[PDB]
């Protein structure tokens, strides 16, 4: 009743994903947090991020289109 037979296709790859298939984002809005430097400097966080390498890190989100680079700002 609860036993199920699996069928497998194994003759050739049907697709090839990137080695970075499982990637991640950081929302653009996070750069508006005053503690952004502390957050992304965290050694604990970087250890967790390293576990997902290789991967893309996409910085973007709704705030992407409301962020302006200012070379003068400290």
């Amino acid at each position: 009743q609860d036993v199920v037979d699996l069928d497998f296709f194994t003759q050739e790859p049907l697709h090839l994903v990137s080695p970075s298939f499982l990637s991640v984002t950081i929302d653009a809005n996070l750069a508006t947090d005053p503690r952004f430097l502390i957050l992304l400097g965290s050694p604990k966080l970087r250890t967790l991020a390293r576990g997902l390498s290789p991967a893309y890190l996409r910085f973007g989100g709704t705030k992407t289109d409301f962020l302006i680079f200012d070379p003068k700002k400290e």
Binding site: F8, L14, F59
Partner: protein, 385 residues
């Protein structure tokens, strides 16, 4: 609701160093709402950033705009897909004149393919498709405000993703055949995630299923919204603690290879027992060329027992079964792998991910409301060597 903000060189450095130190490849979304009088993209600010990044030796890939389908609602500006394509061509010329002349460019980061979004994507690919390296689109299943527990467990909700993927490939094949298609931003639920759901074990059914369907259907890269941040759908919470979807993601990374295969269940119930098959990840030291990685999701309320087909029926199989740590069941923020709670050894040290070797020839047990990986050792699959 959305106001202009500025960001500094420090912020750019914080982001790049995070990525660089973590072995990640940074993709930076440029602001597409900087517009000239004739609604051309004004590239002056982007030029400032490109120059700065080139000055620091930052190897960065680029995007331009996020969800341009929504610009009218968000900013009372409508940019059609043809114009956006031109804007991308102009960004591409800037990249070709920079120190990283071969930098990659992705876009247009449209939402999932409703009528008006599909139209915008089509006109964008017609106009600007030659300069993009991959096509990016976004997906969410549900509104996080109203999503239910029931929805997170519903095959009818999981299945809606299939039609979105089909619609994107239909646009791409009609305009830029063979161009790589990426999910550029994706998660369970929008509005920052579904409270008490998108950060729990229950979130893993959508996440693992999305990965399995994406790989099976031809999507090359899936970008999870978010690694870290304010929304519920984060992989890591505001205390820097990993949530169940982080551990699921780490296991997927360690076990699942690049070469995608196919599994299906006989009797053709395609709904609540969901199965995926790849070659095993060749970087995993424990396994060898030719091994297979099966992963499976059981949305039934009873345990199911899976039987492997010839010639794999008697192979040694390594089980990696994920179940929540109680007392909160599917709504738990803690997970166990083969009965061992997953947690960091210390701030510098991920734990080992310990397999459970099964009795060769045994059926693969998958409890109710659970998901597991199974590595088939010495599978000797030629396609995987």
């Amino acid at each position: 609701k959305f106001k202009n903000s500025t960001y500094s060189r420090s912020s750019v450095d914080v982001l790049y160093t995070f990525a660089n130190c973590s072995g990640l490849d940074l993709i930076f979304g440029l602001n597409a709402l900087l517009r000239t009088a004739d609604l051309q993209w004004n590239s002056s600010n982007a030029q400032l950033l490109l120059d700065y990044c080139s000055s620091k030796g930052y190897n960065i890939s680029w995007e331009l705009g996020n969800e341009p389908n929504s610009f009218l609602k968000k900013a009372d500006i409508f940019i059609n897909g043809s114009q956006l394509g031109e804007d991308f061509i102009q960004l591409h010329k800037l990249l070709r004149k920079s120190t990283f002349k071969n930098a990659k460019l992705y876009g247009p980061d449209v939402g999932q393919p409703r009528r008006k979004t599909a139209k915008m994507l089509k006109s964008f690919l017609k106009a600007g498709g030659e300069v993009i390296d991959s096509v990016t689109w976004h997906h969410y299943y549900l509104n996080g405000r109203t999503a239910t527990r029931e929805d997170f467990l519903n095959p009818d909700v999981l299945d809606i993703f299939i039609s979105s993927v089909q619609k994107v490939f239909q646009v791409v094949e009609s305009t830029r055949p063979g161009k790589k298609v990426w999910l550029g931003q994706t998660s369970s639920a929008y509005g920052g995630g579904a409270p008490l759901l998108s950060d729990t074990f229950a979130a893993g059914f959508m996440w693992l299923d999305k990965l399995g369907l994406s790989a099976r259907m031809g999507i090359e890269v899936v970008m999870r919204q978010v690694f870290f941040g304010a929304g519920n759908y984060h992989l890591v919470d505001e205390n820097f603690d990993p949530l169940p979807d982080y551990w699921l993601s780490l296991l997927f990374k360690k076990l699942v290879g690049t070469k995608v295969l196919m599994a299906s269940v006989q009797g053709s119930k395609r709904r609540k027992l969901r199965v995926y098959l790849h070659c095993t990840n060749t970087d995993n030291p424990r396994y060898k060329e030719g091994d297979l990685t099966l992963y499976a999701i059981n949305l039934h309320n009873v345990t199911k027992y899976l039987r492997l087909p010839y010639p794999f029926s008697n192979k040694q199989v390594d089980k990696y079964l994920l179940r929540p740590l109680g007392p909160h069941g599917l709504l738990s923020k803690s997970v166990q792998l083969n009965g061992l709670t997953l947690k960091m050894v210390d701030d510098q040290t991920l734990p080992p991910l310990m397999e459970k070797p099964l009795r060769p020839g045994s059926s693969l047990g998958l409890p109710a409301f659970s998901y597991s990986f199974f590595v088939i050792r010495n599978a000797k699959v030629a396609a995987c060597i």
